[model samples]
Target: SMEQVAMELRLTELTRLLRSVLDQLQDKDPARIFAQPVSLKEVPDYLDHIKHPMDFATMRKRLEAQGYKNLHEFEEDFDLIIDNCMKYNARDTVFYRAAVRLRDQGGVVLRQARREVDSIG
Candidate 1:
């Protein structure tokens, strides 16, 4: 139950948290972030755009460069960005879909895990 709850809560929070980050960033538009008018769908994947080293050991060497000590903080900022993005652009369909997908997936996984736990318990 703890695992199931943790996973579900984490995934759901992450979905919103990630969106809020994009939303906040989009709010502060400096003609540079978005040259012309680009749709939300065009926005590149978060992890891809932010360059990550090939290996974990190398990544850990420079934790400061990444900003946060853990993924949780990164997620908090991401949510703010998402919230701002939604506020900045009204017709962003992808943003909505991403949030919905996360929520749905969280629900599905939570239920599945719970069922498994029940069977075992």
Candidate 2:
């Protein structure tokens, strides 16, 4: 299902990030690392705000359209977002939607990008 696909992708991203972090942390001593609060902190927000996959509202609508009666009954179905959306022909949309929440309240994230130019002699 789309949700499954999305979830798999998300997990893949997490695994990659974790491994990358581990590679960087491997040589550092725990004591020395923790001593510097900044070193211990990381911004790992992986939400796809620009994709906007099916959320509670969108998912409810999809189920309803499919005659799944009792939208409230499928409350537990939300866990299937990532995977379901991936298979629903709207992976990007769904991803962005999920990212919206993360982008908004993400504890640590690159708020935005900036372009810089160096004036060299």
Candidate 3:
């Protein structure tokens, strides 16, 4: 269906956009982008194990405070945070939840990637 295809494309675009920002931020602030100086019990165990330092709890709280009830509602906030961090010297904030959501929809992105590659092959 056209609607489904459109939805899939939008999801993929969101994921790609999020991933690109994360990579660039990682390059700029490898230490904070990767892990904090100390471990936090508030974040997920996987994030802790991987040493990812983004304060997911803080991001979520801020988002909620700003009336972000859904991903789309907070898209600009996410973008702004990334841009602000890049523009100024700010600490790394967690976009891991967004990243995780993107990965959760990764199958769609992966299939789309695979389809493009297969078409070329």
Candidate 4:
């Protein structure tokens, strides 16, 4: 359907945008980074922004419930979701939509963490 195709296009655009953001987050100040402890508590609430893509939400919930100790876990989970998105078409399910939101949240968290670290230094 045209609507589904549109959704796929949107998903592709969002995924590309998200990848750009993630790439930006990768260039970190190693010395300033991890100056403060990263908290899992700070992240759980962010997942609330995800309303669709139930599979992505469920995966995130399970990861959180397991008490994942770092952002690395979330990034890894995001990779897994992306893999799934590729395996099946992004528009076929809400996976890509959810992935975009999840990636955006990760970018926000990374930005805040970096800002705090920079301030402390």
- Can you write out model 4's per-residue Cα lDDT over 15-91, one digit (the tens) per residue? 44334444443333222221222233864543443322223444434443443334454456545544444443445
Q: How well is each residue in 71-106 modelled by candidate 1, as lDDT tens digits?
A: 445434434433444444345576444434443444
What digit string (tens of lDDT, one per residue) describes model 2 on residues 55-114?
444443444344232223332233333333344335367443543333233212211110
lDDT (tens digit, per residue) of candidate 3 on 19-56: 44334333443334422322445533544243223333
Order of models, best lDDT first:
4, 3, 1, 2
Q: In candidate 4, how many Å is residue 16 off?
A: 27
RMSD of 2: 20.3
Higher-ranked by lDDT: 3 or 4 = 4
Tell me which of candidates 2 and 4 scores higher on lDDT: 4
How many clashes does each candidate structure show, in the order listed? 21, 29, 0, 0
Candidate with maximal TM-score: 3
Clashes of 4: 0
Provide the lDDT at 40 for model 1.
Answer: 32
Error of 2 at 8 (Å): 0.7
Candidate 1 Cα RMSD (Å): 14.0
